Design a protein around this ligand. Sequence first.
Ligand SMILES: O=C(Nc1ccccc1)c1cccc([C@H]2C[C@@H]2NC2CCC2)c1
Ligand SMILES: O=C(Nc1ccccc1)c1cccc([C@H]2C[C@@H]2NC2CCC2)c1
Ligand SMILES: O=C(Nc1ccccc1)c1cccc([C@H]2C[C@@H]2NC2CCC2)c1
Lengths: 133, 666
Amino acid sequence: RKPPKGMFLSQEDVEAVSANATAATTVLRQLDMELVSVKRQIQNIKQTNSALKEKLDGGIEPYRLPEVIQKCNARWTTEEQLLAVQAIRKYGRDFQAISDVIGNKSVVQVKNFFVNYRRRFNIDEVLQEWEAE
Amino acid sequence: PSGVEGAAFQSRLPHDRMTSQEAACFPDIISGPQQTQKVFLFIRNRTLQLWLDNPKIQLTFEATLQQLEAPYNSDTVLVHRVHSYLERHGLINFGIYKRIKPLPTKKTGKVIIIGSGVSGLAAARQLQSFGMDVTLLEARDRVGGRVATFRKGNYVADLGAMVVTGLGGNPMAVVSKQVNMELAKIKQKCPLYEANGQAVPKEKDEMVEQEFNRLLEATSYLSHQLDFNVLNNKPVSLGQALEVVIQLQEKHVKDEQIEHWKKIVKTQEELKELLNKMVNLKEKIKELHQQYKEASEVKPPRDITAEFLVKSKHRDLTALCKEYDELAETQGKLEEKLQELEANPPSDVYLSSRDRQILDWHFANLEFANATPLSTLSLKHWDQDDDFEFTGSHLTVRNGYSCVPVALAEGLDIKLNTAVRQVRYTASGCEVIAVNTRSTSQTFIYKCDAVLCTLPLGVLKQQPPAVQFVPPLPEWKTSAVQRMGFGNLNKVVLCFDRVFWDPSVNLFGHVGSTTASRGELFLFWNLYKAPILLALVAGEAAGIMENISDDVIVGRCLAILKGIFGSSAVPQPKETVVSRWRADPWARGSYSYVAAGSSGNDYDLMAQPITPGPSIPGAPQPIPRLFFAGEHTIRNYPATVHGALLSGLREAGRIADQFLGAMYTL
Ligand SMILES: O=C(Nc1ccccc1)c1cccc([C@H]2C[C@@H]2NC2CCC2)c1
Ligand SMILES: O=C(Nc1ccccc1)c1cccc([C@H]2C[C@@H]2NC2CCC2)c1
Ligand SMILES: O=C(Nc1ccccc1)c1cccc([C@H]2C[C@@H]2NC2CCC2)c1
């Protein structure tokens, strides 16, 4: 009903080999010449990848910055109100990033802040500006 | 099987149903109610049993009924019909039995049998036992035909048939009880040795053999499930189908590597693209650190925008320092994946030239089995008789297979050295025209009611004809003769004074250096009590080595043997014999094979007898006068001795029925 296992005999395949006297030898050679095509291209990409690795020597380790472990706070010093209005102008509504600029405020009351001072800090107006970019 | 049901199986008959033949002799029973059939069936089965468990004496109809038990011994004529049928077609009282009822004083009808091969001898013996006058004409100075046993001193080696194929359902079993054949099993073990002379590692011997067997099953699947039996208007041979399968198995090996290395490139470029992100990110992080440092360098106390700038750049840089890390997880994950695939590369080849060489030796065995190159075998039909193979170990005849034809010849009128040259068959009867082989001027005319031709298919094939038929055989018979395949297979008998091989091995191989020479001395046989090795030449090699002297051939033997056993252990052979069956004028080959474009149906054409036209015009249609036996006339058991024998039994039945009358049909 089906071939023995390991033997591969598709209906399609036989016609390809059967169709001409030398058809099998060509079809094999096509694959044979298409395999070198692939191995030659691994060598290419492997060499390209090796270079790209040469450049990343050092990692990013001279350029890392120490983690700022900071207990969060709920009182908005005038300072960190001002950090905020700036953070909003440079980020828009990325409420997380705006939190790590500040670093004493957690993520939520940055969300809170937006409505609280919405008129005193013209956040709408500030957010329009951010949308020019 | 066991009991009466075993007797039916041992006679190649289904125990629980009636065959087409006995339907034809007993159209009343098989057309009647089931009860009787089982009666008949049991009545037949016991009779076969009685014949079988003692086949050294005639099983007479009286002794049969006498030992039946009621109700089966009540229909006195159904027994007499059953026994008669069985005796007619040689299912009982065939071979060499001591006759109780002595032969009739005067005979009936005249049959000339061409050839005293086993099929000839078998019919003659049956026809004589039916009270006919039988004479056999035989071109050689010996009986047996293609059963040919070499005998010098105590050396006994067989140039013709060597093996009995297993007694389960084999008539030769019966013959072996009536004759002293010393039968010895053939142990299936077969150690290879390649062209250098060193054994094939059991790793390989096992896996190549396994591949051969699957390549076969593969061809069978192209045949039956894909109907690949015609290619550019020509029948497909086994050989082609094998090359097709091997190519599709190489093609897959290649396709398998392509998709695998195409998995390395799909991720080597996925890597390359990642590192591009990595390298670009690192540059960005080169700038941000400088920017952060410059903003950081402005010393406090600063205004809040300059404070935003440090705080901002700082977070902006820990973010980019976050992506470059989520990316380096990914670099690590692809770096192992790339390493993984490099580590499980698929099969490098399908079969190396080392391998394909050993596979070629499995093909020479197949070419031996068929006595022909595989490019000639019908893909569809070459193995069409597999279903009827007997059960049991194969055996050899240790005292020579000749003892059987020679035994069967006892009491028969054989004219040796008598080459039939013309067969004339007409409505009134037949004349067979033979010459003496020693001096061909001496001419003989033999006149007879019927001719049984057991001329080998090669003889029948010969152009110009060794034998002329008058009138010419009808084209349906001559076409079957052309279509069929008569192959070729030759032995070299090497007689030494010292046994230097593995005497626990019956057969060991030699891998042929080339595909072309794969048949050239590829297989050796230790079957005999004397120190005799026996070497095959099959396939395309058979026809070639015919044109090469024995001294060259026994050389190439000693070379192959020395390389496998060491130059010290191989003495010179004391007696040598090299068969050349394609050249032998009374064979013109070895045995039949189902050629591409043939089928097993030609084997039935071969066996179907010739009926001459009428002498007087408008006269009533005549009796058949020309009958055919021989291993090429029995489709279910071709190319074998038990095949020959069965075919001769078959004709003596058909002939006797025609000329003595079948009285068991009422
Ligand atoms: O290969 C052989 N090995 C051998 C090798 C050397 C010496 C003898 C024997 C072989 C020989 C005879 C019959 C078969 C039967 C299974 C094959 N039919 C079908 C079912 C699997 C293919 C095999
Ligand atoms: O090489 C072969 N035989 C061989 C045996 C002994 C020594 C050498 C060689 C062989 C291989 C595959 C199939 C067959 C066909 C005939 C047998 N019919 C049988 C298989 C089950 C029905 C013979
Ligand atoms: O004449 C033969 N058959 C034949 C098959 C096809 C076409 C014509 C003729 C025959 C010749 C040599 C060896 C065998 C051995 C393998 C078979 N062994 C049996 C026990 C395993 C199956 C067969």
